[PDB]
Amino acid sequence: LITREQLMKIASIPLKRKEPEYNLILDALENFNRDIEGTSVKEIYSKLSKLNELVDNYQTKYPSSGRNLALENFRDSLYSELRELIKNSRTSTIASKNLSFIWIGGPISDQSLEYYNMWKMFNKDYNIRLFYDKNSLLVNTLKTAIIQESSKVIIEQNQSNILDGTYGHNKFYSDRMKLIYRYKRELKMLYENMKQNNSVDDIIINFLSNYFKYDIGKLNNQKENNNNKMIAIGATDINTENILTNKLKSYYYQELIQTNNLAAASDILRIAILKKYGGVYCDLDFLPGVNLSLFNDISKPNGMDSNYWEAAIFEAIANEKKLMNNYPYKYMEQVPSEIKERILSFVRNHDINDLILPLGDIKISQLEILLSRLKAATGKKTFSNAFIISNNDSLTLNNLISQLENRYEILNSIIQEKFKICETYDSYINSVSELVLETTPKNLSMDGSSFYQQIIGYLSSGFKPEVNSTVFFSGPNIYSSATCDTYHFIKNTFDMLSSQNQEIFEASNNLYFSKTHDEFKSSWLLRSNIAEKEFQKLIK
């Protein structure tokens, strides 16, 4: 347990009177040791949350007190107590048997249909759903149009000037963005006028035909095609369930219309799905967990990248065990013939259910969510929002929704009316910039500061070559902060958790496989390959 009240006099300073707010801690510690019976897990969490607040209050009132170091060590044991509470509250409690995927804003790929089927094959004890937005199936076409059509206009305004004239070090994206801003701004004007009567797609069809003279008939044909494919896989339409509501519903359409960011939209939708159904959410790039242990008595080639080696293992399973029709040996090319045949013979001599792992019953504490934690650039792991396990009544989930709402409200409170006012992008980033420096709170951690610095480059994300704003607003960073909220008994922090501490909220590796072709194809999002504008000056 936590230490005893008498024991807690490691916090005594010789001949120093006890302060009233010190006694408060001493009383809360007194009762906590006794009153943990006739109790609930959440009320224990709240009592640990009171103890943490009392410590804060003391340390705040007496910044220079000699008791502080003792009380900080004491506070650390609240974390260890939280850790114990989490571990034994995931006893005899499991995640709902829902498995959810999302694919919104365009046609689904045929590889995704294979991956989805793979999940279906190995988890027949789950209700598996694939969520899409029937009303917004042209968002991907819209984003392309915005980019391609604005690229054209700016390249041709500078036809001769391509001989490093004035268009060097990609002054392109600066001028292109000024125009992309105008497009987005006129689309929002359209949207506001039509939204009561029209679907996002109808609004897009209106926008693309009136502004770029795109043919209605073709756009209509893309829609049906897109929708028929979703009908064929038995996708569930989100418009027809109460999944998105109130604030989240707003941010969803904001990502759909104002920023045209489907990844951000799908980050929002993710959260709403889990709060409605709970269970597992998975990215269509991942596959059921593979039993990689069994392949330990096969030594990976000296040159091999560990990831590509494991990718190759699965290609063998997929192929020999005939799990997928369209999964080539792309990463087994690198492997020499002798090793490949050991893999292939190892596969054929093992049972299929010995190789691929089912999700089964996942023990989960009502305090936690479980998250994928993938290796990053440095070789260190980091939270990913590609695989999330949570019941809907989860504390960390409420902190997650709180994080998202908090970050979006802050952002919209400074950009939205200035998007309504500012008629040009220059004027936009000036008016927005002054607002940043006037409203940023005084004392923000390294991270709190990093966050507010992102607001300016929000609109440009995905349109300017190396701006990735949405990690801070809907992506992984809000997960490590919602996790930090829970573990440190606070709310709406911008702070993040240490590797050691993140391990607590980590979803096991047996639960998902991430070394897949479509996943490696997604890793092209962060590259120095931004000078390949030369790919489209060749186009027109």
UniProtKB/Swiss-Prot annotation:
Domain of life assignment: Bacteria
**What are the start and end residues of every segment in region (Glucosyltransferase region)?**
97-473
Question: What free text does the record give on domains?
Answer: The four-helical bundle region mediates binding to phospholipids, such as phosphatidylserine and phosphatidic acid. This promotes localization to the inner face of the cell membrane close to small GTPases.
Segments for region (N-acetylglucosaminyltransferase region): 97-473
What is the name of this protein?
A: N-acetylglucosaminyltransferase TcdA
Cofactors, names only: Mn(2+); Mg(2+)
- Name the job this protein performs: Active form of the toxin, which is released into the host cytosol following autoprocessing and inactivates small GTPases. Acts by mediating monoglycosylation of small GTPases of the Rho family (Rac1, RhoA, RhoG and Cdc42) in host cells at the conserved threonine residue located in the switch I region ('Thr-37/35'), using UDP-N-acetyl-alpha-D-glucosamine as the sugar donor. Monoglycosylation of host small GTPases completely prevents the recognition of the downstream effector, blocking the GTPases in their inactive form, leading to actin cytoskeleton disruption and cell death.
> Which residues bind UDP-N-acetyl-alpha-D-glucosamine per the record?
102-104, 140, 266-270, 283-285, 522-524
Q: Which residues lie within the region annotated Four-helical bundle?
A: 1-92
Cofactor: binding comment:
Has higher activity with Mn(2+), but most likely uses Mg(2+) in host cells. Required for glucosyltransferase activity.
**Which organism is the protein's source?**
Clostridium novyi
Q: Where is the GT44 domain?
A: 97-473
Question: What gene does the UniProt entry assign to this protein?
Answer: tcdA
The lineage is: Bacteria, Bacillati, Bacillota, Clostridia, Eubacteriales
Query: Where in the cell?
Result: Host cytoplasm, Host cytosol; Host cell membrane
